[PDB]
Amino acid sequence: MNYRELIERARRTTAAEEYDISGRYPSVIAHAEGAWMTDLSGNRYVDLTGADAAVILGYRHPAVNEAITRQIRDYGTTFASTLSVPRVELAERMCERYECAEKVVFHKTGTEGTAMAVRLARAATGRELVLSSGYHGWHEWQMAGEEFGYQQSTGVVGFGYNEKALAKMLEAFGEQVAGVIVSPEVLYFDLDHYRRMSALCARYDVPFMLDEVYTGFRAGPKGVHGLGVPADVVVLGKGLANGHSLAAVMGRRDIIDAYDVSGIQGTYTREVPPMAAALAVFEVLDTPGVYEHAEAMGRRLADGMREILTGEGIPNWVGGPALMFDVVLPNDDLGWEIYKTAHDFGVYFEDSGTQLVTAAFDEAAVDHALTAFRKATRQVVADRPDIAPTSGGELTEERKLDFAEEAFGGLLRDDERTNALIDETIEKVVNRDRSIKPVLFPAQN
Amino acid sequence: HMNYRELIERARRTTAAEEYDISGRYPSVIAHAEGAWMTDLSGNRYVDLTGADAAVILGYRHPAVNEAITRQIRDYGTTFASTLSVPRVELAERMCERYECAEKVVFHKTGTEGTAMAVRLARAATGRELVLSSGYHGWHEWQMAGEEFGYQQSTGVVGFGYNEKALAKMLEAFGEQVAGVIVSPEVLYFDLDHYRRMSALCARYDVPFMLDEVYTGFRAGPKGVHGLGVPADVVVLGKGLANGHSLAAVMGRRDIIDAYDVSGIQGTYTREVPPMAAALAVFEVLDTPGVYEHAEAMGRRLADGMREILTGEGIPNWVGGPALMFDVVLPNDDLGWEIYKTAHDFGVYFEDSGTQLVTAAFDEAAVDHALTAFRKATRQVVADRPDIAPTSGGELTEERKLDFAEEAFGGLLRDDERTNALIDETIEKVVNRDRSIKPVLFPAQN
Numbered sequence: 001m002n003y004r005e006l007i008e009r010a011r012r013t014t015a016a017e018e019y020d021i022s023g024r025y026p027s028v029i030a031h032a033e034g035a036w037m038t039d040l041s042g043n044r045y046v047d048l049t050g051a052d053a054a055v056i057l058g059y060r061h062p063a064v065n066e067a068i069t070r071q072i073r074d075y076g077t078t079f080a081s082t083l084s085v086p087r088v089e090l091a092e093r094m095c096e097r098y099e100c101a102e103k104v105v106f107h108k109t110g111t112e113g114t115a116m117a118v119r120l121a122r123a124a125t126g127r128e129l130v131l132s133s134g135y136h137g138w139h140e141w142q143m144a145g146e147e148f149g150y151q152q153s154t155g156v157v158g159f160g161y162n163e164k165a166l167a168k169m170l171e172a173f174g175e176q177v178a179g180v181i182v183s184p185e186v187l188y189f190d191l192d193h194y195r196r197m198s199a200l201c202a203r204y205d206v207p208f209m210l211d212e213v214y215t216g217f218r219a220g221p222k223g224v225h226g227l228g229v230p231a232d233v234v235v236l237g238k239g240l241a242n243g244h245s246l247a248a249v250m251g252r253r254d255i256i257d258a259y260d261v262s263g264i265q266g267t268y269t270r271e272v273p274p275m276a277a278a279l280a281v282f283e284v285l286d287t288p289g290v291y292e293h294a295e296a297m298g299r300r301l302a303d304g305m306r307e308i309l310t311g312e313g314i315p316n317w318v319g320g321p322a323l324m325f326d327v328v329l330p331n332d333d334l335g336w337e338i339y340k341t342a343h344d345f346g347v348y349f350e351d352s353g354t355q356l357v358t359a360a361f362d363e364a365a366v367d368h369a370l371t372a373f374r375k376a377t378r379q380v381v382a383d384r385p386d387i388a389p390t391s392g393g394e395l396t397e398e399r400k401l402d403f404a405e406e407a408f409g410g411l412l413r414d415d416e417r418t419n420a421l422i423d424e425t426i427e428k429v430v431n432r433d434r435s436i437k438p439v440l441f442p443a444q445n
Numbered sequence: 446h447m448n449y450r451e452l453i454e455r456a457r458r459t460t461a462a463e464e465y466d467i468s469g470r471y472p473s474v475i476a477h478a479e480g481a482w483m484t485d486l487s488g489n490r491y492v493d494l495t496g497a498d499a500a501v502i503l504g505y506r507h508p509a510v511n512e513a514i515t516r517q518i519r520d521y522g523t524t525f526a527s528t529l530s531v532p533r534v535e536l537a538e539r540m541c542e543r544y545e546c547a548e549k550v551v552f553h554k555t556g557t558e559g560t561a562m563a564v565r566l567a568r569a570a571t572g573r574e575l576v577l578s579s580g581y582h583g584w585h586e587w588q589m590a591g592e593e594f595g596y597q598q599s600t601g602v603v604g605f606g607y608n609e610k611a612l613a614k615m616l617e618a619f620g621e622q623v624a625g626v627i628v629s630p631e632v633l634y635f636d637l638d639h640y641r642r643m644s645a646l647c648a649r650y651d652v653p654f655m656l657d658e659v660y661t662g663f664r665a666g667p668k669g670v671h672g673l674g675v676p677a678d679v680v681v682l683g684k685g686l687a688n689g690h691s692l693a694a695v696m697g698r699r700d701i702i703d704a705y706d707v708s709g710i711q712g713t714y715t716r717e718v719p720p721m722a723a724a725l726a727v728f729e730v731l732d733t734p735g736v737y738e739h740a741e742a743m744g745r746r747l748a749d750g751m752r753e754i755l756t757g758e759g760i761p762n763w764v765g766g767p768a769l770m771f772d773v774v775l776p777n778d779d780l781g782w783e784i785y786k787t788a789h790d791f792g793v794y795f796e797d798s799g800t801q802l803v804t805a806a807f808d809e810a811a812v813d814h815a816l817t818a819f820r821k822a823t824r825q826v827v828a829d830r831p832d833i834a835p836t837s838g839g840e841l842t843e844e845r846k847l848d849f850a851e852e853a854f855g856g857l858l859r860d861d862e863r864t865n866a867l868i869d870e871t872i873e874k875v876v877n878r879d880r881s882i883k884p885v886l887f888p889a890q891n
């Protein structure tokens with residue numbers, strides 16, 4: 001089949017039009033290896049999406065593939081017992097590897113992983129409320145928590161990465177807070193921002209939980225936590241089994257040991273092959289030079305993209321960790337147009353602007369993507385001058401602050417609107433009808 | 446590592462939930478398995494009658510499934526930058542052809558996420574708030590609370606305990622607010638006509654009827670309860686779907702599935718291709734003539750043998766249900782568990798909740814090995830535990846059967862004052878509530 005034939009069959013039977021077809025490049029991948037993907041007609045592309053961050057080492061990494069296929073073929077996949085030898089070896093490796101990890105439990109998705117983290121924190125502390133910043137998954141309570149404010153029906157207060165807000169919330173009602181769960185954003189904030197968050201939480205005896213489902217292997221080889229941010233729980237997911245479905249919740253012994261009373265479970269949590277894969281992933285990441293080489297390829301790409309944009313006079317900001325750097329542009333139309341055009345030149349750029357190199361990249365792969373980016377940017381600017389300021393200026397502070405709010409719900413201003421939101425939210429929590437709680441297990445009533 | 450005591454100690458230190466992972470399970474850990482048989486860390490062999498807690502339908506390391514999934518992983522890849530793939534479309538095409546309610550189908554990793562998707566899609570498609578529920582749907586709080594009769598305003602879920610009188614009165618009183626009805630079929634106490642009547646009541650109120658077949662999908666029949674002729678607007682599948690590999694599916698009416706975009710559902714691993722290749726192979730095996738019927742013959746052989754063993758010892762019992770998911774109901778909730786713990790000594794993993802699960806890989810030798818173990822174990826427990834092992838013959842009491850239904854799956858089967866008060870009280874609670882207080886919904890409805 002070709003692209004058109006497959007999408008018409010897909011529209012009839014499985015595809016969500018925007019999520020699966022129109023929001024994505026007009027190709028469907030047939031096979032992929034290392035940094036390179038091949039579509040249904042044999043066209044080749046360098047992937048800069050990391051399979052939407054699922055992949056960290058590269059496609060069909062042979063050590064991961066060997067580990068998973070050996071488990072599937074020589075032992076089995078999902079057994080009548082929930083414990084397995086690879087589960088215990090993986091748990092031991094992760095507990096040795098991570099300062100916060102005293103025990104670790106597993107699941108299939110990051111959405112379920114962060115749900116487990118919140119469920120365990122509530123079960124361990126017996127407290128109702130959770131303070132949240134960042135995407136944690138597609139459940140309603142997670143999505144609503146990305147917006148600043150309190151939802152009494154879920155017991156979640158979004159605080160928009162705002163440290164003034166977090167401090168005032170903990171002072172006003174910290175005794176009701178089971179946990180603070182934060183997806184680290186490290187373009188607009190530095191590590192000290194999260195160190196201060198963690199310290200604030202400890203001051204109030206409130207578990208601090210890092211949702212590293214995205215950052216776990218791209219902020220560094222041991223995530224933001226490993227760069228020196230203390231935490232009581234860390235959730236991992238994207239990259240953990242290099243594309244195979246696995247997530248992990250690791251943290252303080254008493255929080256993890258709330259598993260029984262919490263009622264968490266799941267048929268496939270015990271699934272063994274992806275645990276063998278993750279063990280292989282850790283071994284690769286801890287091989288001398290491998291992660292450093294990956295970051296060097298990310299820097300080569302970021303530096304090249306920054307200079308192409310600046311050379312076109314396009315106001316831009318390219319920054320963040322080498323394996324998850326953001327390309328911030330003056331408006332939300334220019335990037336998508338450039339990235340759509342670059343698909344014609346053999347690259348899958350990440351259309352949201354966070355580019356994701358993998359460990360399989362070499363200089364040739366990076367330079368192929370840079371050549372495509374230069375030609376695509378040139379074509380878009382020549383064809384659509386209105387799309388792009390080309391005067392050589394810098395991004396306005398207004399654009400940078402607006403982008404933070406739009407992109408991840410970050411409330412970075414100290415203005416009248418933001419402070420009014422803080423006041424409104426604290427008053428709504430403190431003044432609420434305490435007889436009305438979310439449904440919790442175990443009950444807190 | 447090497448033996449059971451070593452592994453559980455290492456697990457307690459780093460990963461194990463004490464009850465769920467260790468003390469609530471038999472004292473062995475499986476190292477490898479094939480067909481109907483499992484081998485533990487010390488090389489002891491066991492016939493599995495738990496179906497890997499229902500994850501497995503064909504048997505361990507089934508060759509066609511192994512080949513399909515290994516080929517995808519090794520020769521193509523696992524999770525691509527595109528969410529569409531050739532195996533995804535071929536699997537969806539097969540499922541749409543295979544099932545009457547399937548006009549489109551979308552995938553996820555777990556049945557818990559699958560049923561959450563079904564409710565999310567029904568709400569997004571109808572723009573309505575409330576969901577009526579019966580049965581286990583997963584481990585989220587709204588799912589677990591919905592197993593109890595009653596209404597939780599913070600989740601928008603009303604549990605109705607499989608009760609048709611309750612369902613009809615709820616739809617009459619506030620059905621215009623009901624986005625969907627989601628029911629996990631219980632087919633020991635109820636027949637198919639019970640669920641046909643549910644589905645018919647829902648259709649009269651333009652309320653989507655959704656079968657949660659994460660458990661029943663391949664064990665009530667090769668096409669589940671739905672395929673036995675129970676109309677539905679959505680069916681959720683999961684256990685068995687990829688013969689142990691993690692995959693779930695939500696299939697159903699075009700307009701409900703096409704609410705995906707506005708619903709906000711997503712997930713990194715929904716697109717994962719190897720388990721879809723495995724599911725394609727599972728359907729091919731299940732649809733191979735003779736395979737499912739042989740599985741049902743083995744289930745009947747086991748069920749008949751267990752019934753004869755219990756009756757031969759004078760133990761009142763009820764053995765019934767579909768051949769691939771039959772229940773062994775006893776006069777108390779301790780006897781079965783003690784027998785099954787003892788039978789582990791004799792090389793069988795019985796399902797400790799009493800619902801025994803053969804797989805397509807069973808032969809007469811595997812069944813009869815389980816039966817001999819069950820006979821030895823029953824005789825030993827009868828001899829040692831007269832406190833829980835009555836041998837005077839007879840049948841289970843009606844009170845025991847009614848109590849068991851309520852405790853096992855929240856079924857309100859009694860037509861008494863207490864039950865009808867609960868129905869009226871719950872309906873009054875819904876109808877008279879403060880309508881300004883809604884759960885968090887996406888898309889927003891207030």
Ligand SMILES: *Cc1c(COP(=O)(O)O)cnc(C)c1O
Pocket residue numbers: 108109110111112114134135136137138183211212213214215237238711712713714
């Ligand atoms: C991707 C993501 C999740 C959700 O993980 P899924 O496997 O897609 O359900 C949760 N948190 C963060 C920070 C993520 O990036």
Ligand SMILES: *Cc1c(COP(=O)(O)O)cnc(C)c1O
Pocket residue numbers: 265266267268554555556557558560580581582583584629657658659660661683684
């Ligand atoms: C097991 C089960 C679920 C949940 O499936 P998981 O994959 O374990 O999350 C949902 N509904 C029913 C009827 C089930 O038996």
